[PDB]
Amino acid sequence: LRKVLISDSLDPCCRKILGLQVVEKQNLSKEELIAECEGLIVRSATKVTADVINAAEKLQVVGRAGTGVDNVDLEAATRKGILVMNTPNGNSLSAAELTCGMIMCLARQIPQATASMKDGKWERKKFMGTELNGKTLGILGLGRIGREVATRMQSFGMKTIGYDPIISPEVSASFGVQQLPLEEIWPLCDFITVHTPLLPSTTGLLNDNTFAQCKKGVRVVNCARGGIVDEGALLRALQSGQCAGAALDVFTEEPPRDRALVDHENVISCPHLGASTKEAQSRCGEEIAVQFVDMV
Amino acid sequence: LRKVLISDSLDPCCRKILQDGGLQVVEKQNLSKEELIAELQDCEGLIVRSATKVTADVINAAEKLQVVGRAGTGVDNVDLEAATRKGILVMNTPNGNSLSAAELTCGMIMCLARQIPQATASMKDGKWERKKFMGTELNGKTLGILGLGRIGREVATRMQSFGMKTIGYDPIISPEVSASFGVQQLPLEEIWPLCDFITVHTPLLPSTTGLLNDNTFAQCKKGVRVVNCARGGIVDEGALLRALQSGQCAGAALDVFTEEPPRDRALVDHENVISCPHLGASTKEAQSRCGEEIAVQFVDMV
Ligand SMILES: Cn1nc(-c2ccccc2)cc1C(=O)NC1CC1
Numbered sequence: 157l158r159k160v161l162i163s164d165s166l167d168p169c170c171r172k173i174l175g176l177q178v179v180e181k182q183n184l185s186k187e188e189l190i191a192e193c194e195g196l197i198v199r200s201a202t203k204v205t206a207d208v209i210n211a212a213e214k215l216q217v218v219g220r221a222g223t224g225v226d227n228v229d230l231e232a233a234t235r236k237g238i239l240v241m242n243t244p245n246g247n248s249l250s251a252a253e254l255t256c257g258m259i260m261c262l263a264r265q266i267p268q269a270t271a272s273m274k275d276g277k278w279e280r281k282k283f284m285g286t287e288l289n290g291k292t293l294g295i296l297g298l299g300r301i302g303r304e305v306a307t308r309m310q311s312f313g314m315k316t317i318g319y320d321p322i323i324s325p326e327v328s329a330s331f332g333v334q335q336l337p338l339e340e341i342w343p344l345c346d347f348i349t350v351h352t353p354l355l356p357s358t359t360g361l362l363n364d365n366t367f368a369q370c371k372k373g374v375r376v377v378n379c380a381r382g383g384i385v386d387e388g389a390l391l392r393a394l395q396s397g398q399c400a401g402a403a404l405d406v407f408t409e410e411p412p413r414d415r416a417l418v419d420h421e422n423v424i425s426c427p428h429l430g431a432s433t434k435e436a437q438s439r440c441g442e443e444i445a446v447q448f449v450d451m452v
Numbered sequence: 453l454r455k456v457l458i459s460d461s462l463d464p465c466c467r468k469i470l471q472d473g474g475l476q477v478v479e480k481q482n483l484s485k486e487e488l489i490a491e492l493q494d495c496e497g498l499i500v501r502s503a504t505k506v507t508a509d510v511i512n513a514a515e516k517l518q519v520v521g522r523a524g525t526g527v528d529n530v531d532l533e534a535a536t537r538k539g540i541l542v543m544n545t546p547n548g549n550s551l552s553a554a555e556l557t558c559g560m561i562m563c564l565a566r567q568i569p570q571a572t573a574s575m576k577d578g579k580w581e582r583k584k585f586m587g588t589e590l591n592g593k594t595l596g597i598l599g600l601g602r603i604g605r606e607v608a609t610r611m612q613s614f615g616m617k618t619i620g621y622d623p624i625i626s627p628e629v630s631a632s633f634g635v636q637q638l639p640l641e642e643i644w645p646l647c648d649f650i651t652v653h654t655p656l657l658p659s660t661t662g663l664l665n666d667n668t669f670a671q672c673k674k675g676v677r678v679v680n681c682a683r684g685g686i687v688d689e690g691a692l693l694r695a696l697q698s699g700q701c702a703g704a705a706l707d708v709f710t711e712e713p714p715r716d717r718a719l720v721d722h723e724n725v726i727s728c729p730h731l732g733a734s735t736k737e738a739q740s741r742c743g744e745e746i747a748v749q750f751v752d753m754v
C-alpha cells in the first residue's frame with residue numbers, strides 16, 4: 157500500500173496531489189526501470205501489457221489520466237486482482253471543441269486554404285465553402301460529448317438531430333436534439349458527427365450501406381473512436397463524391413499505416429488531439445491523482 | 453431611379469424585388485463594351501456581379517447612370533475613380549455576406565486553439581506528432597471583439613456557447629446594444645491585458661489602421677491569439693510578425709492582407725499563422741443572397 161509511478165508526460169498537478177510518495181519518468185522501453193512500487197499512472201504511450209503486469213507482482217492499482225483504457229490489458233489486470241481506474245469526464249469539453257472545429261474546417265476548407273496559401277497561391281474560386289446556418293447536423297451518440305457538440309452547433313443555426321438507444325427523445329429534446337429512428341437520420345444530414353462508444357453494433361456504423369443512404373455531398377466527423385466510420389467505405393464515398401469531406405482525429409490503427417484517407421484532398425486530420433489541451437490534461441491528471449489518494 | 457439594367461446572372465428574385473418597388477427592369481447577360489453602353493442609355497441603375505466590367509469608358513458614356521450595384525462587398529470590375537468623377541453611387545452587400553464572415557471567424561478561433569490546419573499538414577506529410585500540437589480549451593477564455601456590428605454580434609453569441617467571456621469595444625455601438633448580446637464594453641486599454649483571443653470586425657479607416665500594433669501587442673497578455681477576417685491593415689502586418697517572433701502572439705488567423713494577394717510571404721509562411729485567400733464571403737449561400745440584397749437596397753432608395 158502507498159507508492160506511485162508516473163511513466164508518461166502528465167500535468168505537474170498529478171505529482172503535487174499526495175497520499176505520500178511519487179516517482180516520475182518518461183519514454184521508457186518494455187525493459188524500463190522495472191522495479192515497480194504499488195501504483196502505476198499512465199496516459200497513452202506507456203503499454204500496460206500482460207508481460208509488464210506479470211513482471212510487477214507488487215503492483216496493486218493501474219490508473220489512466222484519460223478516457224478509456226486501450227493501452228491497459230484489463231484481462232491481465234483482473235488475473236492478478238489489479239483494479240483499473242480512468243477519467244471518463246476529463247476530456248469531454250476538449251473533444252467537443254475539437255469536433256466543432258472539425259465541422260468548421262469541413263464547411264470552409266480552412267486546412268486546405270492554409271496549405272494552398274503556404275504553396276504561394278491565391279485561389280479563392282477553388283474554395284467555394286458552405287454556410288452552417290440552416291444546415292442539418294446529425295449527432296450519433298447523445299452522451300456528454302454529443303450533447304456539448306449539439307448546444308455549441310445550435311448557436312450556428314444548425315438543425316441538430318440524432319439518435320441514441322439510451323438517451324430518450326424527451327431527454328435529447330431538453331438539449332435541442334431531435335431524435336428520429338437511425339434510418340431516418342442519414343437522408344437529412346449535411347453533416348454527421350459520431351460520439352458512440354466503440355461496440356460490435358457501432359463498428360462500421362458508417363459503412364457502404366449507410367453512406368448510400370446519406371444525402372449526396374455529406375460531411376463526416378470522427379473525433380470519437382477509430383472504427384465507427386468504416387475507413388474503406390469512407391474512402392470509396394470520398395472518391396465517388398457521396399461524401400464531400402471528412403474530419404478524422406481517430407483511426408483503426410494509430411498512427412494510420414494506410415495513407416489513402418489522410419492523403420485525400422477532402423480529408424482533414426489530427427494525430428489524436430481530442431484530449432490534447434493543457435486544461436483536459438490538468439483535469440485528467442487531477443481526477444486520477446485524487447481517486448488514487450481516495451484509497452483508505 | 454426608374455430603369456435598372458442587370459448586366460450579369462444572379463437569382464430571379466432580384467428582378468421581382470425591383471418590379472415590386474415600381475422599377476423598370478431589363479435583364480441581359482454577356483453584353484459587349486459597345487452593347488452595354490447602348491442598353492444603359494435610358495438606365496439610371498446598373499446591377500453587376502464580376503463578369504461585366506464597368507470601366508471609365510462605360511461610366512462616361514452612360515450619362516444617365518446614377519447607381520451601380522455590386523454582388524458582394526469588396527472591389528474588382530468597377531472603376532471607382534470614374535464613378536467618383538461622375539458622382540455615381542456604388543452599392544455593396546455587407547449584411548448579406550456578414551453571416552459567412554462570422555462563421556469563418558469562429559472557425560479561425562477553433563483553428564488557432566487546436567492548430568487543425570497545421571496538424572492536417574503534419575498528417576499529410578506522414579507524421580504523427582502528438583506533443584507538438586498541445587492545444588488550448590476555449591471554455592473559460594476571454595475573447596475580445598473589436599467592432600460590435602452585425603459580424604461582431606454573430607461571432608459573440610456563437611463563441612458564448614463555447615463558454616468564452618466576450619468583452620469588446622465599438623465607439624458607434626452603445627453599451628446597452630452590446631449588453632443585449634452579452635458583450636461587456638470596456639475602453640481599449642482595459643481590453644488588451646484581459647484577452648486570450650482578439651478578433652477585429654471594423655471597416656478599414658485611419659482610426660482602425662494598425663489597431664493591433666507594437667504598442668497594443670505589448671499591452672496584450674503574452675500568448676494572445678489574433679483573428680483578422682475583416683480588412684487587411686487593421687492588424688499592422690509588420691507588428692504582428694514581431695509578436696509571433698517573440699511569442700507575445702501565440703498565433704494568428706488571417707483571411708485578409710494589406711495587399712491581396714500579399715507579396716511579403718513572411719506572415720503566410722509562419723508556422724503559427726493560419727490563412728485563407730479572402731474567403732469570408734466565399735460560400736454558395738452568401739453569393740446566392742447578395743443579388744437579392746442589391747435589389748432590396750435599390751428599392752430602399754425609392
Ligand atoms: C449503446 N449505444 N449505441 C449508440 C448509438 C447511437 C447512434 C447510432 C448507433 C448507436 C450509443 C450508445 C451509448 O452507449 N450511448 C450512451 C448514452 C451515452
Ligand SMILES: Cn1nc(-c2ccccc2)cc1C(=O)NC1CC1
Binds near residue numbers: 599622653660
Ligand atoms: C468606425 N468604427 N470604429 C470601430 C472600432 C472598434 C474597436 C476599436 C477601434 C475602433 C468600429 C467602428 C464601426 O464602424 N462600427 C460599426 C458597427 C459596425
